[PDB]
C-alpha cells in the first residue's frame, strides 16, 4: 500500500534527484548496488513506498528520467548511485531544448511524451496502491518546465484521482540564470496552477543564503543545495515509511495545508542545520528547533515571510519528543504572534511526528509553509514577463513552434488572478 | 455471563486501545502470549483472546500492533486494515473509504456477539477532529444503531482543546461527527489532552510528557469504569447504569471523565489519601480532564466510582460534604445528583509507569452545562472557517453536500439552545 | 485533638523553622526521614510529616531545605517557591509579586485545616524589615483573618534593633506591616538580634556567635510556647488563652519574649538554678531579648511558663516576691498580672548546640509599655528617612501611593498615644 | 530563575570580559572546554545564572560580544578561555570608531545595533526568569562609549522593567588615555544617567595605586587590573549564585543603594589585598577585612571618599563569619565616624554575607559606596569639557557625523544637574 512513483525531468530535476536517491538508499540501508544492510525491521517494513524488490534482494527505485539531451543522464549513471537505477526508465532524447518552454512542451517534448507516459504506466501497474507521483524539475528551463508541465497535465488526465505532488526550482530576484526565465517560469507556473496537488518553491538564492549566513559554508557546491533540497524531500514522505506518534500522508498535508484549490504553492525548511564550527555550542531543544523552522532566514523560497501571513504551516518532527512540548511551542507562536497567522483559519499550525530520526541526529524537523508572501514571487515573475512581452522581446523563438500570442496573455492572467487571490488573504 | 466487546478507531484508539489491553493484561495475569470472561474469550487450550475490533484504515498502527509485544495475544483478524488513510476528512470516512470495509467490521462485531451469552453491548475508541475517528466511527454507530438498538453503545472521545490543536480542518470533522453521533451514542466519554498536560504539570511534578502516558492515563479510567464487572465489591455498577444515571434527555449525553489521586512517588506519601480528599480533589476545577470551568456551569447528574479500601460511610459523609459547598452548584430539578460504585480490587501499576501504588482510587463522571462553554468555542471556530468556503472543495469533492454544512450548525444551535434551558 | 498549623515565611523565618522542625524531631523521636499530632500529620506508612506552610518569593532557601538533611521529613508542596524575592519592599510583597503565590499558600492552608479536628490556629514566622516577611506576610494575615476569623493568629517576628541594622529601608517596611497587621494578627511575639547578641556575651560568656545559634534560642522558646499542646502537666495553657491574657486593647498586642536560663556547661554547676532564681532571672532588664528598659515602663500582663521539675508553691513564692519589688512597676488596672503555665517534660538539647541540660526552664512573654519607646524610635527614623522623600520612588514604582504613608504615620502616632494613656 | 546576560563592548570591555569570564568559570568548575570538573553541588545548582547547558554537558556562557573592529575580538577568542564561547554571539563591524563616540551611538554603530539586539532577544528568550543586563566598557572611547550607550537605550526601551548595570571604566584626573576623552565621558555619563539603574565606577588610576601601593607590584599589567574588577563584579552577584546568612541580589542591592534614581554611581572595592611578601603577617580578622573595605586606598574610584559623606554602603561579605561580629563593627564605624555618614539615612550601612569563599581565601568582601564625593569626578570631567567646547575644538568630527552643539549643551546641563544633586546631600 501507499507507493510513490518518482519523475526527474531535465538538467536539475535529474540531479536533485540522483542526491534524493542517495538520501532515501541510505535511509533505508540500501547500497549502490541495491543491496540491504541495515540493522532495523524497520527499514525494510515500508521500502515498498520508493522501491521495487528484484530476483536476488535487489531492490530498484520506482523512478523515471527524462531528459531531451543525453549529457545529464549519462552523467548520473557514471555517479555513485547511478547504476542503481532501472536501465529501462532512462528516457532520453537527442535534440536539446534550448532554455525554450515551446520546445518541451509541444515540439520535441510532444515527440518523446508517450514513451515516457508507457513507463510511467507500466510503473503504476505495479502499485498495490499507488498514492501518487513526485516531480522534480526546474521552472526556467526548456526540459523541466515544458516537458516536466506536459508530463503533469497527461498523468492528472489519467490519474486525476491521485496525488501529484512537485519540487519546482524557480528563479531569484538577484541572479537569474537564463535570459527567457520569466516566459518559461510563467509558462510552466500555468500549467501548474490548474494541474497540480501542490508545488514545493525552491529558490536557489535563498539555499546559497542558508549555506553561507547558518551554516557558514564558504564554499557551497550545488551538490550541497541538492543536499538539502534532498533533505526537505525525505521530511514530506517520512510518515509514509516509518511509524511514528502523529502519523501524516501527503493527502493529509494536502488537506491541512490547501484551503482554496489555487494556492498550493509552499515555502519549504528543514532544521536542525548548524555549522560544523558551533555544535557543541547549541542545545537541540525542540523549542530552539521550533524557532528555527519559523525563522525565515531557514527559509527555501525567495520570499520575506514577515511581509504576509500564514494561512496554514505543517510542521513534521522527527525523533523523541514530547507531544506536551511541540503542542505548548505551536501555541506560544500564535498567541504571541497572532498577526502573522490569518485570523479566520483557528489553529494554523498541524503537527506530524515520526519516531525515527534521520542518521546523525537525534532530533529533526520539516516545514511547509503556505505563506501570502509568495505572491512576492509572483508578482516579480509577472513585471519581468511584462517588461518583455509588451517590446516582444525573444518572442520568435516560441511563435516558430507554434505559439501565439494569445497564450502569453492567458498566462499573464493567470497570474495576475492567483496574486489577487493572495492578496485578498493578505 | 456479564460480557463487552471493546471496538478502537484510528491511530488515538488504537493507541489508546493498546494500554488498556496492557492493563487488562496485568490486572488478570495473562501473559503476552495468552497464557475473565468480561473482557476475554477463552479457548480449548489455556488460552485467553482479546474480545476486540481494532480498525484502521492506514495500515501502519495495526503494523505495528501486529509485530510488537502482545502481537500473539490478539487475534489475526481482530486487528483490520485499510489501505488509505481518511487524512482528517470526513467524508472520506463516513461516505467513500469507509463502505469498503464497514461491512467486514459488523461481520466481526456479529461473530462476536455470537460468542456472547450475555452482551452488555459496546465500548468504542475514537477520536473528534480525525479523518477516520470522525466519519468511519458514526458510520459504525449508525450500523451498530440499525443492527443491536438496544444494546449499549458507550463512546470514549478525544474531544479538541480550545488553546491547542494538529489539525486545521478539526471544526469541521467534530462538528460532523456530533450531527451524526447525536442520535445513536447513548454515552460519549471526554478526555482532553491540553488538560492532561495541565494535570501532569500540576499534581504529577512532570513537565516532559508523551501520548504514551496520557494513553496510559486514559486505560487507568476506562479500567475504573469497567472494574465492576470483573471483581467483586459492594455496589456493583453495569455499563447499562450509566445511561440510565448520566442521560436526563437524549441529545444532552456528553459527561466528563476524571480520575483522583493522580499523583507521583513523591508526595503519595506525604498525603494522606483519604476518600473525603479524593472525593474533593475529583471536584476541583483545575483537576478536570478537560478545559472547562465547572464553576461556569451547573451539574446535572455525577456518577462515583470509588475502587479499592473504602469504607461507604466515608463515602456518603465526602458527598454530603461535596453537597453541603455553595460553589458546587446543581440543577433545581435534579436533588438526587449522585451514583455510588465501590470495588474491594485495587488498581493496578504498569511497570515503567508515571503513577504509583495507591490503597484506594476514584473516577468520576459528571454530566453539565461546562460543556456547553465548549460546544459554542467550536460552533465559532467553524463559523469563523466556513464563513470563507475554507478546505470545503475537500469535503465536497468526496460526497458532501453544501447545506449539511448548515444543518449541523442549525442541529448545534439547538444543542445549546437546550443546554440553556436546562441551566434555568 | 488539639492541632496546630505552622506558617514559615522569608529567608528568617525559614531559618528559624528549620531550627524549630529539628528541636521537635529531638523532642518526639522522629528520624530524618518520618520514621505527635499536634504538630505531625500521621500516614498510613509509620511516618510522620509536618503540618507546615513554607514560603519564599527567592528560591535559594527553599532549595538548600529541600538539598539538606531534613528534605525527606517535608512534603514537596508544603515547601513552596517563587521566581524573584521582594528586595527589602514591601510594595513588591503586598501589590506586586504576592498576588501570584498567596493563592496557592491559601489552598495549602485549607488543605491543612481539613486534615485536622480541632485546628487551635496558626503560629507565623516572618520579620518586620525584610521584603517578604513585611508585605506578603501581611497580605496572607489579612486573608486569614477574611477566611477564618475565630482561629488564633500568632505571630512571630523580629524586630529591628535600634543601634544595629542589616538593610536601609527597614524602617518603612515595618511600619507598613505595622500597619497592615494592627488590626489582623491577636499576637505578635518579638525577638531582637542585638538583644541576643547582648545575653550570649553576658550569659553564655560566647562572644563569637552566629544565626544559627540565634535561630536555635528562638526555637528553644517557640518550643516552651507550645509545649502545653503536646505533654502533660498542672496548669496546660493554650494557644487561645494567649489572646485573652496578653491583649487588654485590640491595638495593643506586641509581648516581648524571654527564656532563662540561657546558660553555658561551666556556670550551670556553679549556679542552684531553683524556680525562683530563673523567675528573677526573666524580670531583669540585661536578659531580655529586646533593646528595652523596662523600668521605663509598667508591665500590663505577663505570662510565664515553666517546664520541668517545678513546686507550683515554689513558683507562687517567686510570683509574691516579684510582685513585692518597688522597681517592676505594674498599671494601675492590672493587679492580677501574672499567668502560670506548667509542664513536667523538661527542655531538649540539641547535639552541637549552645545550651547544656536543665532540670527546669522558663519561657516569659511580657505586653509593656517599655515598647512604646521603641516604637516612637521607629517612627523618628521613619520621619527622619521620608522628610527628603528618600526611597519612596522604589514603592510608589509598583503600586504604593504618597498619602499612605502619612496614614501610616498618623497610626503610628495614635498608637503612642494610646499606650501613653495606658501609661497613666 | 535568575538568569543574568553579560554584554561587553569595545576593547576594554571585551578585555575585562574575558578576565571576568575566567573567573566565574574557576569559580564554578567549568573548564575552557565548558566540561564541569567540580568537588560541590553547589557549584551546579545555580550554574544557570550565569551559563546556558548544551549537548553533551557543555556549559556556554550567555555573553554577547560586541566590536565595530575585529582585532580585540580575535585576541579574545584566541586567548585560553575564548573558545568557550558561541561563536554566533560575537557580533563585530569592519571600520574603527576612532575614540568617537558619534561614530559609535549615530553613525557605524546605528548600523550594526540590530543584529546585536537580534541576538539579545534570543538571549532572553532562553532565560526562565531573566534578571537583567550586565554591561562592561570605557567611557572614553567610541565603541564602548557610543555603541555601548546605544545598546543600553535600546534594551532598557525594550525590558523597562529589568535589572540594567554597568561596570564603566573612567577617565582618570592626571593621565588621560585619548584626548576627546571629556567630550565621550560626557555623552555617554549623559545617557546613562537616565538609561540605567546602576553604574559601578572604576578608575584605572585607583588600580594602578592599589597595585602598588598595596599590593606591593612593581609591575603590574592590564590582565592584573582586569583581575582585580573582575573579582569586584564576581562578588555583586555572589549571592545569586550561592547559599548565605543574608541572600543579596542585584535588586536588593539597588533598592538599599539608590535612594534618589538619578544618583546611581558606585565606587567599588574589595578586599582582602595584601602583598605576597606580607601574607603570615596579616591575621585574617572580620575586623581587619572591614577597615580594610572603608579604606580610601582600598577605593577603585578617582575620590577622596573623605571629601564627601556617604549616603550608602552595601557590604558583601564571602566565607564563614559571626554575624554578630559582623553588625558590631558596622555599628562601630558609624558611631565612631557618624560625620562620613548622611544623617537623614539612619543605618547608612547594609550587609549581606554567602557561604562560599573565593578560591584561595577563607574569606572576602566587596564594597559598594554611594559618596557624594563621585561629585568631584563629574565636576572635573564639566570642566575639561567646557574648557575644550568654548573653543569648539575637535567638535568637527562631531558635528560631521551629524551631532549638533545643542547636544553637548544639554549634556553638560545634565552634568551640573547631577553635580547640584549630589552637592545637596554633601
Ligand atoms: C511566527 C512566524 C515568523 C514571524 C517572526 C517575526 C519570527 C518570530 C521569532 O522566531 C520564531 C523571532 C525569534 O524569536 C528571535 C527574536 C529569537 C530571532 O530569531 O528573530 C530574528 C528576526 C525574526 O524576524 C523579525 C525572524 O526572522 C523571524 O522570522 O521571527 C533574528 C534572530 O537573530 C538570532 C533572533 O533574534 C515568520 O515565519
Ligand atoms: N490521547 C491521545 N490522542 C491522540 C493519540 N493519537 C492521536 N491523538 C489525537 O487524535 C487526534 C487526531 O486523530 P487521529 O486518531 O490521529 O486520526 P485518525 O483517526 O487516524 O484519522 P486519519 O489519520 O485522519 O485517517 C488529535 O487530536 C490527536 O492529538 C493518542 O495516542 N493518544
Ligand atoms: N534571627 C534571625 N534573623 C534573621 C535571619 N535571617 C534574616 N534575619 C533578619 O531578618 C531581616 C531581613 O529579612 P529577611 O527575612 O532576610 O528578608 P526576606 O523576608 O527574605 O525578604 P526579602 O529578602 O527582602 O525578599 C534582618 O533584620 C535580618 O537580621 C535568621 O536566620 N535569623
Ligand atoms: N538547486 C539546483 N539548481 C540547479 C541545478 N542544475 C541547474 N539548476 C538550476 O536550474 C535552472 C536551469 O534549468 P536546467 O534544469 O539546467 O534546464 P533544463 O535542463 O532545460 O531543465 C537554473 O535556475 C539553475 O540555477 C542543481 O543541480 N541544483
Ligand atoms: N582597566 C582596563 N582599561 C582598559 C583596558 N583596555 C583599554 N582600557 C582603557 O579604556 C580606555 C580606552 O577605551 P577602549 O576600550 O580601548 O576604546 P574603545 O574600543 O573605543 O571602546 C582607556 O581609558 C584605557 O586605559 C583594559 O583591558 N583594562
Ligand atoms: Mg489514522
Ligand atoms: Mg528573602
Not at chain 1, 501548474?192 to 564554499?219: G, M, S, W
Not at chain 2, 463502505?99 to 456472547?116: H, S
Not at chain 2, 475508541?125 to 444503531?145: A, I, P, Y
Not at chain 2, 430539578?333 to 484506594?360: E, H, S
Amino acid at each position: 500500500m501507499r507507493e510513490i512513483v518518482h519523475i526527474q525531468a531535465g538538467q536539475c530535476g535529474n540531479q536533485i534527484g540522483a542526491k534524493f536517491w542517495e538520501v532515501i538508499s541510505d535511509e533505508h540501508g540500501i547500497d549502490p548496488t541495491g543491496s540491504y544492510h541495515g540493522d532495523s525491521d524497520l527499514q525494510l517494513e515500508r521500502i515498498n513506498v520508493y522501491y521495487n524488490e528484484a530476483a536476488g534482494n535487489k531492490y530498484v527505485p520506482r523512478a523515471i528520467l527524462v531528459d531531451l539531451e543525453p549529457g545529464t543522464m549519462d552523467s548520473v549513471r557514471s555517479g555513485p548511485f547511478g547504476q542503481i537505477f532501472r536501465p529501462d526508465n532512462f528516457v532520453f532524447g537527442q535534440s536539446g531544448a534550448g532554455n525554450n518552454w515551446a520546445k518541451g512542451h509541444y515540439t520535441e517534448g510532444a515527440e518523446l511524451v508517450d514513451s515516457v507516459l508507457d513507463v510511467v504506466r507500466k510503473e503504476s501497474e505495479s502499485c498495490d496502491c499507488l498514492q501518487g507521483f513526485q516531480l522534480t524539475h526546474s521552472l526556467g528551463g526548456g526540459t523541466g518546465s515544458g516537458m516536466g508541465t506536459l508530463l503533469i497535465s497527461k498523468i492528472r488526465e489519467e490519474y486525476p484521482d491521485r496525488i501529484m505532488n512537485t519540487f519546482s526550482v524557480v528563479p531569484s530576484p538577484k541572479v537569474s540564470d537564463t535570459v527567457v526565465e520569466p516566459y518559461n517560469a510563467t509558462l510552466s507556473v500555468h500549467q501548474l496552477v490548474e494541474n497540480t496537488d501542490e508545488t514545493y518553491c525552491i529558490d536557489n538564492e535563498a539555499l546559497y543564503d542558508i549555506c553561507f549566513r547558518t551554516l557558514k559554508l564558504t564554499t557551497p557546491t550545488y551538490g550541497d543545495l541538492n543536499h538539502l533540497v534532498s533533505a526537505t524531500m525525505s521530511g514530506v514522505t517520512t510518515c509514509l515509511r516509518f511509524p511514528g506518534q502523529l502519523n501524516a500522508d501527503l493527502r493529509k498535508l494536502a488537506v491541512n495545508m490547501v484551503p482554496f484549490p489555487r494556492l498550493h504553492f509552499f515555502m519549504p525548511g528543514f532544521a536542525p542545520l548548524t555549522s560544523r564550527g558551533s555544535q557543541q555550542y547549541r542545545a537541540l531543544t525542540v523549542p530552539e528547533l521550533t524557532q528555527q523552522m519559523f525563522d525565515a532566514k531557514n527559509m527555501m523560497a525567495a520570499c520575506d515571510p514577515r511581509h504576509g501571513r500564514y494561512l496554514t504551516v505543517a510542521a513534521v518532527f522527527r525523533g523523541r519528543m514530547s507531544m506536551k512540548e511541540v503542542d505548548e511551542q505551536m501555541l506560544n507562536v500564535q498567541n504571541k504572534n497572532s498577526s502573522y497567522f490569518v485570523e479566520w483559519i483557528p489553529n494554523n499550525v498541524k503537527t506530524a511526528v515520526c519516531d525515527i530520526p534521520p542518521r546523525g541526529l537525534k532530533m529533526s524537523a520539516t516545514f511547509i509553509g503556505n505563506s501570502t508572501a509568495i505572491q512576492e514571487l509572483f508578482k516579480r515573475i509577472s513585471e519581468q514577463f511584462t517588461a518583455m512581452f509588451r517590446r516582444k522581446a525573444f518572442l520568435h523563438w516560441y511563435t516558430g513552434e507554434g505559439m501565439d500570442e494569445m497564450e502569453f496573455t492567458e498566462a499573464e492572467s493567470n497570474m495576475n488572478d492567483l496574486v489577487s487571490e493572495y492578496q485578498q488573504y493578505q | 455471563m456479564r460480557e463487552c466487546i471493546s471496538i478502537h478507531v484510528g491511530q488515538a484508539g488504537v493507541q489508546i486501545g493498546n494500554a488498556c489491553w496492557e492493563l487488562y493484561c496485568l490486572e488478570h495475569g495473562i501473559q503476552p502470549d495468552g497464557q475473565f470472561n468480561t473482557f476475554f474469550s477463552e479457548t480449548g487450550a489455556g488460552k485467553h483472546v482479546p474480545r476486540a475490533v481494532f480498525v484502521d484504515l492506514e495500515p501502519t498502527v495495526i503494523d505495528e500492533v501486529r509485530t510488537g509485544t502482545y502481537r500473539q495475544l490478539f487475534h489475526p483478524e481482530q486487528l483490520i486494515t485499510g489501505k488509505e488513510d481518511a487524512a482528517n476528512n470526513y467524508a472520506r470516512g463516513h461516505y467513500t473509504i469507509g463502505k469498503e470495509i464497514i461491512d467486514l467490521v459488523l461481520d466481526r462485531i456479529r461473530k462476536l456477539a455470537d460468542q456472547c451469552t450475555g452482551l452488555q453491548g459496546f465500548l468504542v475508541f475514537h477520536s473528534f477532529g480525525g479523518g477516520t475517528g470522525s466519519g468511519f466511527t458514526s458510520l459504525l454507530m449508525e450500523r451498530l444503531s440499525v443492527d443491536y438498538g438496544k444494546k449499549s453503545k458507550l463512546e470514549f472521545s478525544i474531544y479538541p482543546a480550545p488553546q491547542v490543536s494538529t489539525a486545521v480542518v478539526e471544526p469541521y470533522n467534530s462538528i460532523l461527527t456530533t450531527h451524526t453521533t447525536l442520535e445513536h451514542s447513548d454515552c460519549a466519554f471526554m478526555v482532553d489532552n491540553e488538560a492532561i498536560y495541565d494535570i501532569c504539570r500540576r499534581n504529577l511534578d512532570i513537565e516532559r510528557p508523551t501520548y504514551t502516558n496520557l494513553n496510559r492515563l486514559i486505560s487507568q479510567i476506562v479500567s475504573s469504569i469497567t472494574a465492576s464487572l470483573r471483581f467483586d465489591g459492594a455496589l456493583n455498577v453495569d455499563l447499562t447504569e450509566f445511561q440510565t444515571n448520566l442521560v436526563p434527555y437524549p441529545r444532552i449525553h456528553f459527561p466528563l471523565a476524571t480520575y483522583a489521586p493522580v499523583i507521583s512517588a513523591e508526595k503519595a506519601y506525604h498525603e494522606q489519601l483519604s476518600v473525603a480528599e479524593i472525593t474533593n480533589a475529583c471536584f476541583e476545577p483545575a483537576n478536570q480532564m478537560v478545559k472547562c470551568d465547572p464553576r461556569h456551569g451547573k451539574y446535572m447528574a455525577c456518577c462515583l466510582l470509588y475502587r479499592g479500601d473504602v469504607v461507604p460511610k466515608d463515602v456518603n459523609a465526602a458527598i454530603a460534604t461535596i453537597k453541603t459547598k455553595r460553589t458546587i452548584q446543581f440543577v433545581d430539578w435534579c436533588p438526587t445528583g449522585f451514583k455510588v460504585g465501590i470495588n474491594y480490587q485495587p488498581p493496578t501499576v504498569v511497570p515503567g509507569g508515571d503513577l504509583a501504588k495507591v490503597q484506594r482510587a476514584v473516577c468520576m463522571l459528571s454530566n453539565t452545562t461546562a460543556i456547553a462553554e465548549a460546544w459554542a468555542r467550536l460552533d465559532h471556530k467553524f463559523d469563523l472557517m466556513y464563513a470563507k468556503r475554507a478546505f470545503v472543495h475537500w469535503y465536497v469533492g468526496e460526497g458532501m453536500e453544501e447545506g449539511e454544512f448548515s444543518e449541523a450548525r442549525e442541529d448545534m444551535a439547538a444543542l445549546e439552545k437546550d443546554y440553556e434551558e436546562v441551566g434555568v
